[PDB]
């Protein structure tokens, strides 16, 4: 059973089958969020997210879906907006604290472990609910490009490619196929186009609604290891390539 | 489709569907049980009265203060569960005396009303980030009356909801629904204080559960020279007999 009545109406309760159902429901909440993907490059990572333009009123430039945790870490989340923004704030604080302490950018593994610990803590006690946001974040540091995914349960792993949100199914399949075709390690310029293609192929489940995609990438060779958005000619080239369907 | 027991009725931390916060709502229900209180404001003063609600003749009708003073120019009338009102009045008096001590000047009525509603707000987070002080909102609602040179005679109603309104005329407590309806029927800007107090007696008679008498009803007035002063039993009896002389027949 996916529900397990009785044992699910309170956090930090083990069901007769080992599951703690509140984390399962938090995972369920992650489904409804906007699809997001992150692709690992031989020297960087590429992020793409399908921001649905809900209404004309939103100011296009300042309304951004991809949050920057630090100069060298990009982050995108799917699920509950408040939890996502709060978690991003915690990540930014951790980056600031670590940099202030050692005066060097935090390597991605330590930051990912810290955020996984933070998320996991909320699943432990009765008075707090699990974070209902699945997050993709990564960047480049002394040890090269890294791309991590952490779940509401606090579990996380290194990923050659990750996907979330409502369109997770087809996007995940297409990303599997991409990594299968190109095990050599895609370049950032190639990964931008591939991510745009994959994210458009995820739009077929919500055809009727208008959408825009923000593409940002961090690469050792391209941007000296600084996380910078894609704007102008490169993004339009990605449009044209993916428009081939 | 099945009828099931609700639970949003319990606790102040739960919103009902359509976003209604009931436990504050039922708190305002408890106000209706309290003694009727009436107030009327005019450019020449403000008057207010209260049903004493003497449960038995043995109780001392002279020693149940539903009307009290907060400062020389500022007083108030209250209704509901008087226990919380005691704390509310004590806080109001403390704030007024502290303000006068610190600034050597009279407390503006609006500032006092804001301070009182801030205490009433404490069932949740305070207006300045203070932690919650109590598990439930006050079961008390009151209307403040006073005079300020920058505002003139004015009458503020304050709920337990942390909200307050300036009122030309107001009613709370038992039967205060019809009381306020009749006030809206009767009130006009040109009322003089004599007419104001006689109208208060009239509305109290209309709403009161038994015969209107000086031993169960009492009045208060705010005047620049007089400040806050409560009418004595003889004065109230004079006003009541004047009521049956003027309005009746």
């Amino acid at each position: 059973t996916s529900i397990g009545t009785g044992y699910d109406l309170s956090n930090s309760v083990f069901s007769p089958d080992g599951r703690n159902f509140q984390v399962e429901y938090a995972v369920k909440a992650v489904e409804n969020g906007t699809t997001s993907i992150g692709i690992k490059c031989n020297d960087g990572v590429v992020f793409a997210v399908e921001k649905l333009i809900t209404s004309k009123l939103l100011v296009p430039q300042k309304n951004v879906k991809i949050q920057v945790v630090d100069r060298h870490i990009g982050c995108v989340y799917s699920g509950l907006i408040p939890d996502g923004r709060h978690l991003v704030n915690r990540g930014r604080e951790e980056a600031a604290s670590f940099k202030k302490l050692y005066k060097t950018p935090i390597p991605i593994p330590a930051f990912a472990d810290r955020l996984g610990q933070y998320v996991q803590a909320h699943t432990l006690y009765n008075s707090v609910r699990p974070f209902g946001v699945s997050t993709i974040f990564g960047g480049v540091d002394k040890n090269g490009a890294h791309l991590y995914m952490l779940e509401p349960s606090g579990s996380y792993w290194g990923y050659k490619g990750a996907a979330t949100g409502k369109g997770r199914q087809s996007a995940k399949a297409e990303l599997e196929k991409l990594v299968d075709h190109h095990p050599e390690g895609l370049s950032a310029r190639e990964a931008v186009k591939q991510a745009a293609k994959i994210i458009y192929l995820a739009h077929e489940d919500n055809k009727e609604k208008d959408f825009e995609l923000e593409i940002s990438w961090c690469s050792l060779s391209e941007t000296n290891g600084l996380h910078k958005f894609v704007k102008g000619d490169l993004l339009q080239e990605a449009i044209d390539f993916a428009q081939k369907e | 489709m099945f009828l099931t027991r609700s639970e949003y009725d319990r606790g102040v931390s739960t919103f009902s569907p359509e976003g209604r916060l009931f436990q504050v709502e039922y708190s305002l229900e408890a106000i209706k049980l309290g003694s009727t209180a009436i107030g009327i404001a005019t450019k020449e003063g403000v008057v207010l009265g209260v049903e004493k609600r003497a449960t038995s003749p043995l109780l001392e009708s002279d020693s149940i203060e539903k009307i009290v003073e907060i400062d020389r120019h500022i007083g108030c009338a209250m209704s509901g569960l008087t226990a919380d009102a005691r704390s509310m009045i004590e806080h109001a008096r403390t704030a007024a005396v502290t303000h006068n001590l610190y600034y050597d000047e009279d407390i503006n009525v609006e500032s006092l009303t804001q301070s009182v509603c801030d205490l009433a707000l404490r069932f949740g987070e305070g207006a300045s980030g203070e932690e919650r002080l109590m598990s439930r909102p006050f079961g008390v609602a009151l209307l403040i009356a006073g005079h300020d040179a920058d505002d003139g005679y004015q009458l503020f109603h304050a709920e337990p909801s942390g909200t307050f309104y300036r009122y030309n005329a107001k009613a709370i407590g038992s039967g205060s629904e019809g009381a306020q309806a009749e006030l809206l029927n009767e009130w006009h800007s040109s009322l003089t204080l004599k007419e104001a107090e006689l109208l208060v007696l009239k509305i109290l008679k209309q709403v009161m559960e038994e015969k209107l008498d000086e031993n169960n009803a009492q009045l208060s007035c705010i005047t620049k020279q007089d400040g806050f002063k409560i009418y004595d039993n003889e004065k109230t009896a004079e006003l009541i007999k004047e009521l049956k002389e003027k309005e009746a027949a």
Binding site: - | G11, Y26, L58, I64, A83, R136
Partner: protein, 235 residues
């Protein structure tokens, strides 16, 4: 709704505090009467089993100071502790200020203590309603106040609490004329004895009496058997 202190009933009540007040009805009857210059408190002592030691802890009516008397009905255990806190406050006031506690002040403090034990759901409210009485320091006016578990308190010319309260209160309502309250101590004591006799079918052995007088004078009687007889002669 009755499950906790922190939630109003839909009609505006707080059923838990009302249940506590009802529990106050469980205890024995206690009554107080304000005379012109004296205050009389009578108490229905539970019919003593012959094995009880009469010479120790006989009185429920107890002193809070040389000029204040406290009586109660309901849960005795809570009452003792409330009395202890009242005594602590009275002496603290005598220390911090030269003048002793005004009876109004003491009853306000007891009402605050009872209310404070109702502010949070973690503590049971005291199932007691005290009947503080006395004379203000150096002032001849008798004072008599009643407190309730909710913290509501009010001054009375005469009031009853405890078991079978309604019978006594109705009797006092009929027989007490505020235009001419009983002046002399004897008349007030006779009125109190008559009031309790409407509830206590047992003889005078059950009725305790305390008389408090201005200028810090408190005395407990052991001769009301004569008063009981006189009411019998009047009956």
């Amino acid at each position: 709704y009755d499950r906790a202190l922190s939630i109003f009933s839909p009609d505006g009540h707080i059923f838990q505090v009302e249940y506590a007040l009802e529990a106050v009805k469980r205890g024995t009857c206690a009554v107080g009467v304000k005379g012109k210059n004296c205050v009389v408190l009578g108490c229905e002592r539970r019919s003593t089993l012959k094995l009880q030691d009469t010479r120790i802890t006989p009185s429920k009516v107890s002193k809070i100071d040389s000029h204040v008397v406290l009586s109660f009905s309901g849960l005795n255990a809570d009452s003792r502790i409330l009395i202890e806190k009242a005594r602590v406050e009275a002496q603290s006031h005598r220390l911090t200020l030269e003048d002793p506690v005004t009876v109004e002040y003491l009853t306000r403090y007891v009402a605050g203590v009872q209310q404070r034990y109702t502010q949070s759901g973690g503590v049971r409210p005291f199932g007691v309603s005290t009947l503080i009485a006395g004379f203000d320091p150096r002032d001849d006016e008798p004072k008599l106040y009643q407190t309730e578990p909710s913290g509501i308190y009010s001054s009375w010319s005469a009031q009853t609490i405890g078991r079978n309260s309604k019978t006594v209160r109705e009797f006092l309502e009929k027989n007490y004329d505020r235009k001419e309250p009983p002046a002399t101590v004897e008349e007030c004591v006779k009125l109190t004895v008559r009031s309790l006799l409407e509830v206590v079918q047992t003889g005078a052995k059950n009725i305790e009496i305390t008389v408090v007088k201005p200028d810090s004078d408190i005395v407990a009687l052991s001769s009301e058997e004569i008063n009981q007889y006189v009411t019998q002669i009047e009956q």
